[PDB]
């Protein structure tokens, strides 16, 4: 966490910084998109 890392979540590849999220989306919801229609918030598979 908290550094420039190349991440691969369930085949979703990307590069960026992973931070603890205060977002509160409902338990059934998995991904989180933005205005530009790209994933900015994610939920880890191993630990929810």
């Amino acid at each position: 966490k908290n550094k420039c890392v190349n991440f691969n979540f369930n085949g979703l590849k990307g590069t960026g910084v992973l931070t603890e999220s205060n977002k509160k989306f409902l338990p059934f919801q998995q991904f989180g998109r933005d205005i530009a229609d790209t994933t900015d918030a994610v939920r880890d598979p191993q630990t929810l």
């Binding site: 205005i35 530009a36 229609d37 790209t38």
Partner: protein, 48 residues
């Protein structure tokens, strides 16, 4: 002289009050900003 001074002061006051009370007077400048903003937004949408 003093009549002209009174007319000038009253005209300035009327301009101030009318400019305050009319929101569409400054559309042109406002319009400018809107264009740029909208344009930028459109470009972002093109990534989707």
């Amino acid at each position: 002289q003093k009549l002209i001074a009174n007319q000038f002061n009253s005209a300035i006051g009327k301009i101030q009050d009318s400019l305050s009370s009319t929101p569409s007077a400054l559309g042109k400048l406002q319009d400018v900003v809107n264009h740029n903003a909208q344009a930028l937004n459109t470009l972002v949408k093109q990534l989707s």
